[PDB]
Design a protein around this ligand. Sequence first.
Ligand SMILES: Nc1ncnc2c1ncn2[C@@H]1O[C@H](COP(=O)(O)OP(=O)(O)OP(=O)(O)O)[C@@H](O)[C@H]1O
Length: 328
Amino acid sequence: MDPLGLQDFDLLRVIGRGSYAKVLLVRLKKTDRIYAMKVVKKELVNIDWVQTEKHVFEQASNHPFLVGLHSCFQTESRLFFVIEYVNGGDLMFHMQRQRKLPEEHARFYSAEISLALNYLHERGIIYRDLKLDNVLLDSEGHIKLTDYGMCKEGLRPGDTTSTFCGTPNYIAPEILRGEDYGFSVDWWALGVLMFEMMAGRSPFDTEDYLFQVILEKQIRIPRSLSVKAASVLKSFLNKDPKERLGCHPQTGFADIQGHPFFRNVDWDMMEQKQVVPPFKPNISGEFGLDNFDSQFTNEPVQLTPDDDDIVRKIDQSEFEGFEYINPL
Ligand SMILES: Nc1ncnc2c1ncn2[C@@H]1O[C@H](COP(=O)(O)OP(=O)(O)OP(=O)(O)O)[C@@H](O)[C@H]1O
């Protein structure tokens, strides 16, 4: 009946690695439930990467299309975030096989993404890293936004922020112009993503040049796309934030829903997960491990032994209060 620690988990598999986290599939023994667990060595964060992740995960959790936080704990060397295991692959891989999605399919995904982004936004958070490989699919085919490492988390009314970041292909013109910006940059990114889903290529097709393309060149809509598909791509991919779909100060989200491209969507049904996804993820392997790279799943299921020369220099006071258990 004590607060959670490593001791309470079976390590099942290594499933992922990013710049910060080693990501493992784990099982909470006493409940037999499985989770992903992000393992971040303290030597990486000895700054407030930590608080932002923790808050975003929290502010999220229990929303249908965002990866939620089960619990956080620490050891002497590491932080651990225990989170929902999402095992249906990701839009990236999915675009590779499909090459190009039907407009109906892209509508479904962009609806679920839109709901997720709006929800984030109404809690003062700019996602800032929407891209195909940050849209996971759960086992049933519903999306979940992942990777909150880029998020900004404290935007009150209009209020703005300033940091140049994001993934090159998805970076809004505001940011590229070095403007102050709000939520607008997420809707731009959704435009790029939707274009990718329906056209099967980036709308931008040297990183210095890419930024020149984004800023100064007209976007070519592929001729085979419906009028509604063209309209919505043109609206989200407006270079002017003020004029961009979803970006109007008070009715942003309302406009998105009211856009003809979306006329078929029952938003309340979508938000409740009562729309049947257009695609059912294949779940092969134990716990669907086959949807993860084998370079990860073939790793030994362990944490790398600590190194005292490093571990002794960690200021442990920096992580007081890290511990968390969700309140559901
Ligand atoms: N909730 C999850 N369920 C299943 N797999 C996940 C989950 N979160 C992350 N992964 C796997 O782990 C990989 C690395 O996670 P992520 O990209 O979030 O790492 P990070 O180090 O936190 O972020 P960054 O690399 O952006 O700094 C993901 O691409 C994904 O394959």
